[PDB]
Amino acid sequence: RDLLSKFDGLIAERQKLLDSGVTDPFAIVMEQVKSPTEAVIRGKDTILLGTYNYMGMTFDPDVIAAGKEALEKFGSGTNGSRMLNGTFHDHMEVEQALRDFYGTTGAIVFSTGYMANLGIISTLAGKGEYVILDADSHASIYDGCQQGNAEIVRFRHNSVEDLDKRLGRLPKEPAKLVVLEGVYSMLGDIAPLKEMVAVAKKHGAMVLVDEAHSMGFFGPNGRGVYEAQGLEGQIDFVVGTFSKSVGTVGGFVVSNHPKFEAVRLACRPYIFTASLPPSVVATATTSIRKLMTAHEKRERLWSNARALHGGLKAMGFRLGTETCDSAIVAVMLEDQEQAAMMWQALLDGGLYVNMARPPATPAGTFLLRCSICAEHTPAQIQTVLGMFQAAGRAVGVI
Amino acid sequence: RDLLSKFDGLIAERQKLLDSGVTDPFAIVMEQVKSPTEAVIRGKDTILLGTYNYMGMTFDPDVIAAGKEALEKFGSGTNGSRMLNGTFHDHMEVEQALRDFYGTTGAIVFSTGYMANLGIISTLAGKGEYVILDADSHASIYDGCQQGNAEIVRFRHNSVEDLDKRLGRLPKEPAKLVVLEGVYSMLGDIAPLKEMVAVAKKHGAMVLVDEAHSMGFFGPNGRGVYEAQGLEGQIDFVVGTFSKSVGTVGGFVVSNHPKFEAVRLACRPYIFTASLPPSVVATATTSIRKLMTAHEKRERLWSNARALHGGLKAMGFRLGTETCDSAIVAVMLEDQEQAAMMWQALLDGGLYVNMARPPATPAGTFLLRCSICAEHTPAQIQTVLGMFQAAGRAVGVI
């Protein structure tokens, strides 16, 4: 036995899944990517319906030109931390783009969204302070809690009442951070932010909202669910990512707090890593700025989501949401076998969606998660619906 | 008081430093970067001597062409995890390049080196197991320990004897991970890996060596200090980064362990983040492959390092090492004021080096850290030495 013996269970489980004849869902390779909505997988032209490229920015010609120009002018990397030699022209640009996008005075970019959550949670809340979060929060949020020294207070998923009761039992004096997500990504439902933020404020907590799954398409300025729910000016910190709507890699936190940017002086995941490559921050800058006014894309995204959500439900699929509330549409299946058969039939027929099974989801929950793109055409969405009808029948969903 | 009140001390300290008239060392912006060794800072042409671009790969024409081609062909980002939709052609390529570079069957790429350390340490060693590390290990290694549930065992810095004594007192049965760095980056000295690995093996521990500061220029194949010290085939895991010699962003761990790649199934910082952009993994692939045989660069790097190290010592600077053992040359100054005055005079004269003061360094240690590049010319190195002589005099080092 050695350090890897602990993986024997996971290795056996994987082999059991493969024994069913299914393609390994954790080893899919996009051999070619023709556009935000088309790839070649296993030598087959395939519609993409399992990416977080919500606004189709990855092939935007301005984004691509900015990336190429940055490679040419500044090279492939920075070879240093933001606190030393790794802040180039384009890093300053991308932080200003976030200030402009969110209407904040402060903006701190990290090398990943995971690291932004890890860092901001573990740095803001110290010993004797409290981080209060939804039971089903993103892994990076839990990892930020684990990385820090604060008291961690979970509340029942999606429960305004349990948030209120749990907050109310904490001592009044210590500072507190309530961490919320605008969109619950598993099912694509929306958090009751207006009510939860009111509860947080009643108890004197600061609020951090993750708006990774809403950027560019919720609220008048595309700032997120909090903006859509009228909370502009009430959110202490907003965390996000460059890997979804923005279409690259990176993380950020924005704020209007006067001391915010002193976080750079303390935050270990900000300090102890190289800054992002020039091309990454140049593509992010361009993309963020375009997202401020990408009205045609926003309209298409929501039109597509409504057509997919409406079509799957009408067919008889059980969805994670009664109404189309986000760009994630989750199809709920009865068991692991049904989900795998559906996923495989879709893939073989030319469609890629994400499958989620335990322990990614709770025991008893087996999903196909579809994520819509501004650049899907109405034709593609109908093709997808046809594919879902054909697979749902061969498998016997529906 | 709120969550940011804890930063009042750091804010006051920063203001005290600025009160001396020094440029803020934590807010330097590379406005233009002409080459690996030249930038424009504060409107002034400046020689770069504080980057980890050891092999000058960031402006390599093959690296740049690969990045541009990847933007064009695959877009700006992947919008998904490696376990879902984020593995493109170029991700498979970069992991194969690492296998070829290190002669291993296993290779796992992460979105940063920080995350590779965070993830591999917290995933390999669980409850009831031990992570044994040097007191002065990199922050990411300590953060990996904090993220995991293992027992953490620090040993006195650079002490083979204390490693042996501390290891020997642990229970025999539980699995153990000894984590070592090939190059101690603060001063640029080298770990006694041959002796430490022998000690680790005597006690039945697995060994993880970080070779971030040696890639491409230690050992016959450029694999690192462990290779230079004859330890090929004896190291269980080697961790590294794409941000130094490789010249982009990203992290990795390589191994020949038969179960290694099952780490993908468990490792939270691998699973819960987007994969790197196509351009990043394409530039990394190209760079890694060129590093396998970059003999001219290697020779220049070491020639430059020897000239800088030899020249600074002869001038009368106290260096962190008696002999030129790495591409980091650390100048030790008597106090914080001396270091800041030296740093400012160098900057104003057209040279950028890194300054390190407490709490980055231990109390009593005040450094200028020079990092050499394969692409520095002998002329630049003499210019640098002239600048060090001029500043050392105006300040009164030397």
Ligand SMILES: *Cc1c(COP(=O)(O)O)cnc(C)c1O
């Ligand atoms: C996607 C996501 C992250 C991680 O972002 P990456 O940039 O991919 O590391 C963090 N939090 C939430 C809620 C996310 O959805």
Ligand SMILES: *Cc1c(COP(=O)(O)O)cnc(C)c1O
């Ligand atoms: C630079 C470094 C890291 C971090 O690498 P990044 O890729 O910049 O996140 C981790 N460990 C060591 C020893 C390092 O030197």
Ligand SMILES: [Mg+2]
């Ligand atoms: Mg094309």
Ligand SMILES: [Mg+2]
């Ligand atoms: Mg140029």
